[PDB]
Design a protein around this ligand. Structure first.
Ligand SMILES: NC(=O)c1ccc[n+]([C@@H]2O[C@H](COP(=O)([O-])OP(=O)(O)OC[C@H]3O[C@@H](n4cnc5c(N)ncnc54)[C@H](O)[C@@H]3O)[C@@H](O)[C@H]2O)c1
Ligand SMILES: NC(=O)c1ccc[n+]([C@@H]2O[C@H](COP(=O)([O-])OP(=O)(O)OC[C@H]3O[C@@H](n4cnc5c(N)ncnc54)[C@H](O)[C@@H]3O)[C@@H](O)[C@H]2O)c1
Ligand SMILES: NC(=O)c1ccc[n+]([C@@H]2O[C@H](COP(=O)([O-])OP(=O)(O)OC[C@H]3O[C@@H](n4cnc5c(N)ncnc54)[C@H](O)[C@@H]3O)[C@@H](O)[C@H]2O)c1
Ligand SMILES: NC(=O)c1ccc[n+]([C@@H]2O[C@H](COP(=O)([O-])OP(=O)(O)OC[C@H]3O[C@@H](n4cnc5c(N)ncnc54)[C@H](O)[C@@H]3O)[C@@H](O)[C@H]2O)c1
Ligand SMILES: Nc1ncnc2c1ncn2[C@@H]1O[C@H](CO)[C@@H](O)[C@H]1O
Ligand SMILES: [K+]
Ligand SMILES: [K+]
Ligand SMILES: [K+]
Ligand SMILES: [K+]
Ligand SMILES: [Zn+2]
Ligand SMILES: [Zn+2]
Ligand SMILES: [Zn+2]
Ligand SMILES: [Zn+2]
Lengths: 460, 460, 461, 460
């Protein structure tokens, strides 16, 4: 019996070739393999994992396994799996349920296949999640499983928000580590990852020249910062929208004009509030917010003909694709690339000029239309994931008495010392040489020679 | 009015012309003037101020005065005063003791003139400092004055470190606000300020082409980040040194090669530990650390002939200028520009090829050889200073009983809401338009429509 | 009824046609020529042998030539550069095309032969459109009687032009040519900005490597090397540049690059001792951009850092000594057009060996081999020039001229600056750009007509 | 020695210090000194020179003198002289008539002092010019002097246009070399020089932050290209205007929005044709064209309040400053910085908000408000000048028989081989290493191993 489901198992050899390359690009993660090999700190760990089934995730999975864990895996997005990576993991004997181009029903089924082994709840004791979907399903549908789970390690900004809401409401059942907010995650992956992979995805989907054209990036947090750079470095004229004036100040100082889709920044919900002159000149819009309906129906109506629309935030509801499905006709160009014809719902003229190009049906475009962030960037994120798994598994929350569990429910980050140790391995991967403080210098600035080098207030 | 000392009072009209321009470049600060003029929240405040006597400081001073304060002012660096600014402030009837090109004895005398009025301690009740020199003098020499002081507002990273050391040792006598760590200060002034003003100062001092040449920036905190950009945007080939691997990871991802002056980063004090091949190719070295002896004697010996050496950190001991004074002959090119001849102490050949060019005798180069950060950047820093002064003055720490002082004796930052309000005014100064969240969107991400928009953990 | 073609898979035609319809919207200069000249049919009677990368962009070029009255027979000028959906869409429109991605060399030559011959005999060709000179060479060496009836050659690329100029110098060029490459809207658009767009694109598609923070060496700093260096630097690479031309090297220095040679003091003595092994041992990526031979040589390949990526974006694969690598080292295909080359020996390799290089597109032009080459909106410039060049030579009717008049016209020329400007204006309008009109006084002041041309022929832009 | 006029001879020692530094930054020029010292190829040359009396020109002058020439010198702009450079040249016994801040009458008088020695025409036999003013004066007022002059070497685009017009009309009396169109001049000086010195000048004059603000650059030739980069690299949002669609295409591809000051690009001279919405958002306008009235009266009226206006083309008539003198009130901020009050001609309110800031009264801003291009860039231009002087002086046009003069009366550029030799010295100055072709490679591409490497048609 094959305890997996993937698109095509014959892609395994290709995937394995790419894993071998990726190992060479992931020194922090491979360093953890070597360092913790002897101890087997994840011996006895049974990890439910839900995160984009890419080559990078493959190296993460095999690191967890190399440190003693067993896992059962699914992707956290319908379009993000690399089928060769899924195949290589399945062929190594690891249960994985993932393919590129899942339906929503298949997506839920894949998560269910990780949770259930041979038709009963798996004896899971750890969770690794990216976006909170697996966390939500366990809490909603398998609450008894959480009695035996020691913790959740959550990858992404959106997932963390959802955890913090559960904690505030008293509905979170196990502790978590916010992996996102290690500096080697948030200020590496979220920013430089998107810098690498946004323009990549747009080129693969459309092959559009970007230089000389007008872009609007909605948001200027870590993803928006990286996204804006991805485009500006290509020669786009990028405008930035924000609701956060500090982030907007950064965009101004970084050389971007800060604009709103709405007249005076006020959305009244009508077309009259749209800055039609602005949107009529935009060739590309990218959403980066983790919020809802930031590229709304009225904005879509006002966009320049033939504009590209995409989202690089975690969930597709940043863009009102439901409005587009209800009202406009979709013409598939190729997979994950649709022309959306604004002439009506029922059919289209093949030579119509009044369309938008939507990438990945509004799902995470970097992963949907390309391969997401590169190995050398994901090295940081995933070294943090491994450290976080070790920490929570060692803490054994599920074995605490009921009264003490109540006291130990938290959402925490990894210590700065570990964040530094990850960064050092990343730096060495580039051939970088960090200088060691003399004793006198360390005394002068008030730190130990080995670090940590900054107070916890430091923002980098 | 005679209660001042400046280089040349006849420069006042020029200074006033420049203050009128700077007011138009400082909307956050001017907005505070207009908003608080009626209420006079600083009525009764008597502020000892020690910060670079520039045009920008002039607008700060006159804002404090417009809100009801009286001040006595000095510069916190011997080369940083703009004499026209000092003159304009003196001519407005405000006690100021500052000029460009002070001796160290004059520097101390100027601070003493703020502390003493007519030969006796002034009835000061507030302190505004940049670097901690005034704060140190008050604690060491005028402890009775601190009994009646409500707080200190400290501008810069180095000054904050000194406060935090005092707090750790139980020697801090009054509460402080860390103005540096507002995002609209640290991630504006320290970074973009240096981006603007480093290349500016080097051009004014040397008129050297930077494009195509090799630079080494020591440090990659906010100043090193801004400094590196200042140089790279001019076409320099910039290498970065760091002791902090997180900051080094950022430098790598930002497109810099990370190097150490020392073989394997080990600074053992020996000549042989210097990477002679590296230093022999460097045309410019810039120190940005806030630490001691980061451009040391052995590094200076190994630098390429005709290299420029400068420091943009707060204090001159980043570079071992004492070694250069003791051993090498100094030839003044023009004010704040010296050729340092490595051939010997006693005289030099006017056509010697083996020299370095030192800017501002190792003191902060942006202020020493140019005019420091631009008005529109200092607007952020100084709007924070004003808000910080208001907050501590209203809290009236000096008048609290002993038991209540114990609860308030701390080093704090301004609330994020105020940091955002400053940023908004900066954004509007650029013509930027921030978007207003809908109530549904604000609920979705868990914030009020008016902000604050981020949790206190957020790093931007 | 139409069968006069050979492509990978005709069922890709609908996809290709969807992409052509998008590309038309990205190519205003080319589409402007279609609309302007449709009525007049200036290429009526033209029979064009075409040899250029069978991409979507070439598809729009082909259909423009056809829309203006031409008939064509087409092949690609590179074994890896065809987009199969584009080839299919062209075949389905009834146009003879012989092209697919992943040709062998024998197939490549056969495809060119299929354009030249129709039903086993020389086609009644009267025009040539070429990219690199291979078709031009075959006609001159093997089909001289066909050249008697050919009015001209329009040549796309720097390499091809060099070959034409050599023929002209030797008195062996049989028909006139237009150097399309040296329109400013080609050379300083396509060769530079095209590579800026498509180099990093190809490297990402092939390897998915992070480029930021890593060390690159770009060999050459002409238009391709300039664009290539920018492609990498804009991604955060630390880029070093090599050049033999000191003017181009001066530009690289001023542009913010360190200028280095693979050889100690720039002198190759042919031995491994002349290699700067310390330099090459730190390089993660090398890119050749020269149009020259063996600029990434065997000794350089031996000295490169383990796991370095090697690629070429010049016209021909001999920039890199891949023959040395085939003879001496073991090739492991990662996926199509991506090979690990194991430096441990010829016969087999360890799957976990660390001492390999990654070669893209077997050393053939990487932007077209591992991605889709330049974007439509850039190729618009190049291809509007191709169309204008075809119109000009076809109208001149060189083949029909008497001997004495042929002597006067047998040359390699560029398009007039006025036309180069007209192409540029349509490109600018495509971006929504608004050019200012000179007043009469201003035009007089600088000595030009209000409509242009705006610069003397000496101007370098 | 009294045969000079400069602002202040006591600045000579400072000038000499700066010349000694500049020599180290000018390897091509110093290489020419060493190479040609023995031959003294300019022995007997008597050169009238008219070009910006900067430190860089000082090194040029002393190179000509070191190769045997005698000279008489003036500046080609009223604001471009560096008084320390003029002083150092006078103190070396060389006739120079130049100071910063000349009136137009003084400017003409200075040129006349070069032409006349001891009250009568000097026995000049060579001319070095920058802009054509000296050339025009010789042709119009001293035609008899041209009978004994062997040639003109002309530095700049505007000067060359004027020569080519003279040649076309049959009014040019001596041959010329177009120094501008060496690649090591035009594509070095005109572009990278302005990149270095435009932002420099704006900072020195105003100390304005540039990041985040809106600029409009009129022109995108070599100067406009370099100017646009100067601003964009600082984080300005730069828009570009052009009449040349090829240059406009380059601006688009380089990442700029191309706009016209006039609606649809049509300049009918009416206020109605101005794009007031566009100009109302511009904080900085820079003219780069070498044309007339490209920043016209109606544009000046429509500019955003407090916009900076400047010109970096050769002559001040790019901007309609005559209109501003006739209609608006000028308030000097400091030398070469004026607020132009749009409220009327006769007086102004010191606190008026409706003004523009004009730099250098519309004269070349880089030289007027800073020091022009850096030594290492001018090295290229001036090595070309020296080679051009050698070539024409050795040809001895004035002494040629009539039939041979006819053949040599032309405006020519230097051979590409020499352009390459200059570039090589510049590259070596950066520590750059050029590769030598193998014999097989040289054969393959059809060039000699030593060069020239490109055909004359090549545009770089
Ligand atoms: N695609 C990827 O590979 C990838 C990588 C990292 C994170 N993410 C996801 O991207 C999203 C953003 O993450 P982040 O770390 O940048 O978060 P963040 O909190 O740093 O930034 C989001 C920004 O959006 C802004 N914003 C919110 N509503 C807005 C509106 N209506 N208009 C304009 N701006 C608005 C906020 O002010 C904030 O600055 C999340 O969903 C996260 O999980 C995706
Ligand atoms: N000149 C200006 O206008 C200006 C502006 C703002 C702040 N400052 C001053 O600049 C200094 C730096 O401030 P900051 O905000 O960047 O502080 P920071 O803590 O953000 O950055 C300093 C960096 O230096 C690094 N460092 C320390 N010792 C080092 C060594 N031996 N080698 C290499 N790197 C080393 C640290 O790791 C740290 O990242 C302080 O003195 C501050 O007061 C100057
Ligand atoms: N891949 C593409 O899409 C594409 C696009 C346009 C042109 N091209 C091709 O790229 C090649 C280059 O074209 P180009 O327009 O840049 O030509 P170019 O003449 O402008 O530039 C080539 C440069 O290579 C330099 N060079 C030569 N030998 C060298 C060596 N041994 N080491 C270092 N530098 C050396 C030359 O000095 C020259 O500056 C040609 O083969 C051309 O056909 C490819
Ligand atoms: N300040 C300096 O140090 C310096 C340096 C080099 C040259 N220059 C001078 O700068 C000027 C420009 O020189 P260049 O080499 O760039 O010349 P150029 O011919 O390369 O460029 C000038 C550009 O202006 C454009 N133009 C003309 N009229 C225009 C209009 N009405 N609106 C918009 N664009 C218009 C032209 O199309 C052209 O592209 C000349 O006067 C030259 O002598 C000054
Ligand atoms: N123009 C300026 N006026 C006043 N302070 C300045 C200026 N430029 C930089 N600074 C300050 O210098 C400090 C370093 O001592 C920084 O914290 C910064 O706030
Ligand atoms: K990837
Ligand atoms: K300033
Ligand atoms: K393409
Ligand atoms: K200068
Ligand atoms: Zn996820
Ligand atoms: Zn200070
Ligand atoms: Zn070709
Ligand atoms: Zn001049």
């Amino acid at each position: 019996f094959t305890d997996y489901k993937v698109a095509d198992i014959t892609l395994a050899a290709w995937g394995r070739r790419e894993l071998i390359i990726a190992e060479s690009e992931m020194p922090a993660l491979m360093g953890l393999r070597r360092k913790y090999a002897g101890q087997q700190p994840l011996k006895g760990a049974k990890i439910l994992g839900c995160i984009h089934m890419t080559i990078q995730t493959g190296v993460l999975i095999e690191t967890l396994v190399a440190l003693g864990a067993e896992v059962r895996w699914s992707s956290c997005n319908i379009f993000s799996t690399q089928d060769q990576a899924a195949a290589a993991i399945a062929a190594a004997g690891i249960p994985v349920f993932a393919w590129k181009g899942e339906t929503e029903e298949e997506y839920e089924w894949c998560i269910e296949q990780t949770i259930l082994k041979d038709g009963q709840p798996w004896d899971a004791n750890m969770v690794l999640d990216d976006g909170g979907d697996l966390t939500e399903i366990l809490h909603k549908k398998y609450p008894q499983m959480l009695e035996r789970i020691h913790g959740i390690t959550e990858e992404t900004t959106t997932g963390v928000h959802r955890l913090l809401d559960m904690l505030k409401n008293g509905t979170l059942k196990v502790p978590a580590i916010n992996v996102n907010d290690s500096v080697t995650k948030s200020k590496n992956d979220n920013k430089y990852g998107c810098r690498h992979s946004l323009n990549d995805a747009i080129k693969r989907g459309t092959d559009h020249l970007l230089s000389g054209k007008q872009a609007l990036v909605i948001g200027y947090g870590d993803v928006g910062k990286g996204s804006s750079q991805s485009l500006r470095q290509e020669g786009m004229i990028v405008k930035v929208a924000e609701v956060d004036p500090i982030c907007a100040m950064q965009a101004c100082m970084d050389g971007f004009e800060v604009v709103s889709p709405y007249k005076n920044g006020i959305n009244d919900g009508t077309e009259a509030s749209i800055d039609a002159a602005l949107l009529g000149k935009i060739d590309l819009i990218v959403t980066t917010t983790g919020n809802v309906n930031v590229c709304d129906a009225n904005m879509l109506k006002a966009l320049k003909k033939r504009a590209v629309v995409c989202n690089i935030g975690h969930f597709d509801n940043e863009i009102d694709t439901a409005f587009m499905r209800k009202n406009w006709a979709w013409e598939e160009v190729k997979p994950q690339v649709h022309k959306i014809h604004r002439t009506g719902k029922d059919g289209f003229d093949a030579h119509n000029d009044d369309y938008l190009i939507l990438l990945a049906e509004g799902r995470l475009v970097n992963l949907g239309n390309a391969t997401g962030h590169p190995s050398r960037i994901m090295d940081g994120s995933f070294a943090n994931q491994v450290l976080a798994q070790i920490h929570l598994f060692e803490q054994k929350y599920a074995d605490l008495p009921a009264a003490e569990k109540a006291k130990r429910l938290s959402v925490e980050v990894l210590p700065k010392k570990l964040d530094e140790e990850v960064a050092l391995e990343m730096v060495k991967g580039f051939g970088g040489v960090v200088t060691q403080l003399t004793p006198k210098q360390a005394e002068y600035i008030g730190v130990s020679v080995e670090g940590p080098f900054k107070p916890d207030t430091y923002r980098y």
